[PDB]
Amino acid sequence: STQYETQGYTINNAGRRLVVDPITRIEGHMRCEVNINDQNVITNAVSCGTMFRGLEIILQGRDPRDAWAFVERICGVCTGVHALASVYAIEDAIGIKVPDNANIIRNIMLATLWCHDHLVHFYQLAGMDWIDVLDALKADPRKTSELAQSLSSWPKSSPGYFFDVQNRLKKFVEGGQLGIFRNGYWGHPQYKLPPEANLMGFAHYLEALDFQREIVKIHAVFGGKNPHPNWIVGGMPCAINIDESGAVGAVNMERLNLVQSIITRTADFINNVMIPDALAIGQFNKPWSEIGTGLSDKCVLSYGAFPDIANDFGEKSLLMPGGAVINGDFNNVLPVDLVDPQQVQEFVDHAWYRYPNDQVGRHPFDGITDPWYNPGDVKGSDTNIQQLNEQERYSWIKAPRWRGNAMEVGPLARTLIAYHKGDAATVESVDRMMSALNLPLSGIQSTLGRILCRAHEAQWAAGKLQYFFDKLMTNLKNGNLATASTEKWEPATWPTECRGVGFTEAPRGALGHWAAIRDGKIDLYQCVVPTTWNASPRDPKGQIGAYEAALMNTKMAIPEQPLEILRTLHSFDPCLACSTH
Amino acid sequence: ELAQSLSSWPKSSPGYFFDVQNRLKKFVEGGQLGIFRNGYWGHPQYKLPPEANLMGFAHYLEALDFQREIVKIHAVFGGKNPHPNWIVGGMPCAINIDESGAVGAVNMERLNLVQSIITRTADFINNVMIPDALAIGQFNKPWSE
Amino acid sequence: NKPRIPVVWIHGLECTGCTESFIRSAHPLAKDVILSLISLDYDDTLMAAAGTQAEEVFEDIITQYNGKYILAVEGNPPLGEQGMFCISSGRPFIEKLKRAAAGASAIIAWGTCASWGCVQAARPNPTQATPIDKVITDKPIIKVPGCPPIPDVMSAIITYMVTFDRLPDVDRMGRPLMFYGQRIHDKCYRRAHFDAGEFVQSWDDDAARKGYCLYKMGCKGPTTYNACSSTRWNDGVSFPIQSGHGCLGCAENGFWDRGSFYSRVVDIPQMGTHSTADTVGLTALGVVAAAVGVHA
Amino acid sequence: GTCASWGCVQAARPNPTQATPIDKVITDKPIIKVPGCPPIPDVMSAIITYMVTFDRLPDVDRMGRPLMFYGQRIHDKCYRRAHFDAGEFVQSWDDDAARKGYCLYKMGCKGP
Ligand code: SF4
Ligand code: SF4
Ligand code: FCO
Ligand code: F3S
Ligand SMILES: [Cl-]
Ligand SMILES: [Cl-]
Ligand SMILES: [Mg+2]
Ligand code: NI
Known part of the structure; x- marks a missing residue:
């Protein structure tokens, strides 16, 4: 039994210990442990990354131009973002400027990922936390139709359609082969949708599963394939040819026509299916606007993203604002510098790594990735963890801090940053969105709020797609076709020794690559990934990360059924391969 | 309500027909009626109620889009549509399912595409065209003579 | 059922x-x-x-x-x-x-x-x-x-x-x-250029804008078994080579450690038809131009 | 057309x-x-x-x-060019060559 105070929380590991391993409907491997009191309230929360590959080690000695391809494989879900960060970093180190079209295309690649990733998470990952799939079998199709048609202009809403969906589902289960729905949490008292809403939700789950495949066709045009499209240091390899012989071998008018058709359909699906479904979940789960706040009312971080001016990563360029808020002071958004050794630092005193001194944090330029599996006494064995020891080392995830502060990153974080920086579109959008639910602005700082912010981001990204596409076409109309700068492609043109930073906003939050080059080879490559922030273990001050904070003080209706834990965790959209890399 | 009374087809929301109606209204408000120009609109033999006309026109647009998909079956087995290719003695589309070089022939993946088109085609015909044919029948019965 | x-x-x-x-x-x-x-x-x-x-x-x-x-x-x-x-x-x-x-x-x-x-x-x-x-x-x-x-x-x-x-x-x-x-290289729609000796030499050159072969940009197509050049990616929309990047060899064992992706593949027969015949012609044209005295 | x-x-x-x-x-x-x-x-x-x-x-x-x-010509961008230059041709319909997607030059292809 131990007890201590941090960031307003009272961490108490007395009482019943609950273990959720594996955490499902996330990317990668995660283990969560909690302690609950007699009132079934969480008094202690333990976030554990249960996987490690070691990309930072693998990249040592390689050619900086190959780096993007290695680090892209950090994650297949947020596929492409690490490659973007990578070329950003290497171009920063060497001093390469890419052509305008290369920047616009990269922006398109990122926006596309945002749309796809947010959509899939909403339905395929987080969705069944809110939608009681088996309860859909009890709905009335005619009212399901009425409900859907009362919420959206989406065409697919006929009673016959919903009846067909319900029928297939009925047949699917009738055999006892429930597949992904087996042994679920169906009927849990926290499931609050009416049967008609569950049927509407499940139907859309299927529609989203189908449609998501279309979105990534934009990646296929510009980057060859999805998952894991291709990129180059100096721009993009997708040469453009509109009006000249051999256009059949390049990005031509027909190719761009395809891209345009996907943009329209993507904005259509997000705006008229996902958005209304997000609001709908909000309407029937309003108490969760007050559950899982965690660090979101205290400390939030964004690096910023989508440079609209090519090679300019300043505040006048990034369309997605960067900044940090600490101590709940949202009236003072602080500027972020990724070179400053005093801002971003990583601790490993509670992680399975080794430092010369684990009581201090290391800026990624001073980063060390030295795997050291050392779980302590876990009430079992080294190969049999019954209970993690959170007093000591308990995770493969490093503990990032900003100026010593534990931060939340992601859609909710970015939204708060953008809102309080006074971005007119975000203010209006958030205001409008909260008005519709009859909720105060504070309601966004929650488990529900994360999901709402994610959906709004998809809408935002879908809009940006069109903006970027138009920007590209404008250049082509003006005869500006260049997609690559090769002035500094040859290692002989590089500084003998240099370093750089690549940063952007991944679907799950602030991403950074720190790279050092010496004699044409990678000397150091360190990654600090969004889920690394959110799923962080504790630091030498015992400060807890975003997940553990959000889980604190959470009421559970049935201890053996961790639906509440799942709801909160999934709201963060955990990517564990990202977090550990 | 009319559409939903006649078919299981999913695309039938009020918002959907409103959108279709608006696209058409915008289209004509320019005086550029295109293929609709100098038509026989308002002829006494036009017997569908306004709602049946909107339903019909929406389905006209849906058919215009979807017809392109059906002929993908011709593209698999005959290379292209219009005007697929044939041979005296059978068909030139050699089949390879389970052996090396199946990538250069009609394979499981190609066949999967064909199956996916067949399902979608039967679905469109049975739930859009069929009910519309039946609807035109209901409103134009004198033309059965 | x-x-x-x-x-x-x-x-x-x-x-x-x-x-x-x-x-x-x-x-x-x-x-x-x-x-x-x-x-x-x-x-x-x-x-x-x-x-x-x-x-x-x-x-x-x-x-x-x-x-x-x-x-x-x-x-x-x-x-x-x-x-x-x-x-x-x-x-x-x-x-x-x-x-x-x-x-x-x-x-x-x-x-x-x-x-x-x-x-x-x-x-x-x-x-x-x-x-x-x-x-x-x-x-x-x-x-x-x-x-x-x-x-x-x-x-x-x-x-x-x-x-x-x-x-x-x-x-x-x-x-x-x-x-x-089969290999990517054996069904690649850019073989014509490979076979002619028409290569991209640097990103976004005129060769790249005409969709020439990516062999000299490190394409590992010649040693990679996969269907990308025939079946293609994402409902046949594209594949790596078609969008302008050489094959990394990602279907092959240990392809990560086969040198840089931008380094040429080795032990792959490669003699261009038009590249060789252009050489043969200028060699002969230059031999004659030397003897006549209109060299250079 | x-x-x-x-x-x-x-x-x-x-x-x-x-x-x-x-x-x-x-x-x-x-x-x-x-x-x-x-x-x-x-x-x-x-x-x-x-x-x-x-x-x-x-x-x-x-x-x-x-x-x-x-x-450009069809033959300049045909995915069966590898077979053409190797001298791997379909000789009659539905032979083993055809089932591996070999070149159709000897079947009269006017791609060139
Ligand atoms: S080397 Fe690559 S681009 Fe060239 S023909 Fe072979 S597979 Fe295609
Ligand atoms: S002759 Fe015809 S089948 Fe053969 S490579 Fe050329 S275009 Fe293709
Ligand atoms: N989004 C995303 Fe993946 C994480 N965390 C990355 O970067
Ligand atoms: S996708 Fe195919 S093109 Fe090469 S890099 Fe992988 S085998
Ligand atoms: Cl669609
Ligand atoms: Cl269809
Ligand atoms: Mg790292
Ligand atoms: Ni990820």
Whole structure:
């Protein structure tokens, strides 16, 4: 039994210990442990990354131009973002400027990922936390139709359609082969949708599963394939040819026509299916606007993203604002510098790594990735963890801090940053969105709020797609076709020794690559990934990360059924391969 | 309500027909009626109620889009549509399912595409065209003579 | 009705790119695969149950359907640190893998990870990541390599095994002949340029804008077995070479450690027709121009 | 298409009707030939979108065909070229060569 105070929380590991391993409907491997009191309230929360590959080690000695391809494989879900960060970093180190079209295309690649990733998470990952799939079998199709048609202009809403969906589902289960729905949490008292809403939700789950495949066709045009499209240091390899012989071998008018058709359909699906479904979940789960706040009312971080001016990563360029808020002071958004050794630092005193001194944090330029599996006494064995020891080392995830502060990153974080920086579109959008639910602005700082912010981001990204596409076409109309700068492609043109930073906003939050080059080879490559922030273990001050904070003080209706834990965790959209890399 | 009374087809929301109606209204408000120009609109033999006309026109647009998909079956087995290719003695589309070089022939993946088109085609015909044919029948019965 | 064949999909060290690829399937849609062709009875990425509920599902399936389910494996087991580089239910992932494989009738090794080792197995392989066939030796394993494999290839292999009720024919390496029988280079739509000696020499040159061959930009097409040049990616929209980047060789064992991606492939015969005949002509034109005295 | 561009099937021997391509009849107007029987659907639309978006006619070869889609030959971008140059040919329909997707040059392919 131990007890201590941090960031307003009272961490108490007395009482019943609950273990959720594996955490499902996330990317990668995660283990969560909690302690609950007699009132079934969480008094202690333990976030554990249960996987490690070691990309930072693998990249040592390689050619900086190959780096993007290695680090892209950090994650297949947020596929492409690490490659973007990578070329950003290497171009920063060497001093390469890419052509305008290369920047616009990269922006398109990122926006596309945002749309796809947010959509899939909403339905395929987080969705069944809110939608009681088996309860859909009890709905009335005619009212399901009425409900859907009362919420959206989406065409697919006929009673016959919903009846067909319900029928297939009925047949699917009738055999006892429930597949992904087996042994679920169906009927849990926290499931609050009416049967008609569950049927509407499940139907859309299927529609989203189908449609998501279309979105990534934009990646296929510009980057060859999805998952894991291709990129180059100096721009993009997708040469453009509109009006000249051999256009059949390049990005031509027909190719761009395809891209345009996907943009329209993507904005259509997000705006008229996902958005209304997000609001709908909000309407029937309003108490969760007050559950899982965690660090979101205290400390939030964004690096910023989508440079609209090519090679300019300043505040006048990034369309997605960067900044940090600490101590709940949202009236003072602080500027972020990724070179400053005093801002971003990583601790490993509670992680399975080794430092010369684990009581201090290391800026990624001073980063060390030295795997050291050392779980302590876990009430079992080294190969049999019954209970993690959170007093000591308990995770493969490093503990990032900003100026010593534990931060939340992601859609909710970015939204708060953008809102309080006074971005007119975000203010209006958030205001409008909260008005519709009859909720105060504070309601966004929650488990529900994360999901709402994610959906709004998809809408935002879908809009940006069109903006970027138009920007590209404008250049082509003006005869500006260049997609690559090769002035500094040859290692002989590089500084003998240099370093750089690549940063952007991944679907799950602030991403950074720190790279050092010496004699044409990678000397150091360190990654600090969004889920690394959110799923962080504790630091030498015992400060807890975003997940553990959000889980604190959470009421559970049935201890053996961790639906509440799942709801909160999934709201963060955990990517564990990202977090550990 | 009319559409939903006649078919299981999913695309039938009020918002959907409103959108279709608006696209058409915008289209004509320019005086550029295109293929609709100098038509026989308002002829006494036009017997569908306004709602049946909107339903019909929406389905006209849906058919215009979807017809392109059906002929993908011709593209698999005959290379292209219009005007697929044939041979005296059978068909030139050699089949390879389970052996090396199946990538250069009609394979499981190609066949999967064909199956996916067949399902979608039967679905469109049975739930859009069929009910519309039946609807035109209901409103134009004198033309059965 | 009809029961569907039970499928257990487990995850080791991976990026979940293979699972993502699977759900990109255009025909059949992943939705219909899950609904009608198979019974996806366990899959961490998609399943509702977590924790002890997930464990119960796993145990129930492999016990009830013992000897009768297909084991699909994404990622690979690490041998380092007693296997605790990948922990599932507080135990080494390898234990789960072995327990799952013991009851499987056949195993599908999705992607380069499960097939070969992929990125985590690259120098210096910090975790000792090991391909499945090095751990499991008593079961049929079908390797479906690529990083990730083509979505429609994945589904086609599934539909094949369901429809024809058997495993696909494989090479000496365990790859299905149907999609891995030939090289990218042997079905590449840019061979014409390769064969003529017409190459991209630097990004976005005139050659690149005409879609010339990427051999001199490091394309590993000549040594890579896959369907990307015929079947193509994402409903036949494109593939790496078509969008202007050379093949990395991502379907091939240890391709990460085969030098830089921008370094030319070696031991591949290459003599251009127009490149050689242009040389022969100028050599002869220059020999004559020298003798006549209009050199230079 | 080939009809308006060249004459196509009705103009073939012995051209019973004396079918004549448009550019033999109209000689004082810019004519963009988009040949093929028929042309590729998406090529047709891409040409249309080009003219609308860029507000200009596409650049054309010496024959009046848009360079963007007609600047190269089929044989210049055929995915079976590897077999052609290797001398791997289909010799009769549905032989093992055909089942591996070998080159169709000896079956009369006019791609070149
Ligand atoms: S080297 Fe690459 S681009 Fe060139 S023909 Fe071969 S596979 Fe195609
Ligand atoms: S002759 Fe025909 S089949 Fe052979 S490579 Fe050329 S275009 Fe292709
Ligand atoms: N989004 C995303 Fe993946 C994480 N965390 C990355 O970067
Ligand atoms: S990189 Fe992989 S995707 Fe195909 S083109 Fe080469 S095998
Ligand atoms: Cl769609
Ligand atoms: Cl359709
Ligand atoms: Mg790191
Ligand atoms: Ni990720």
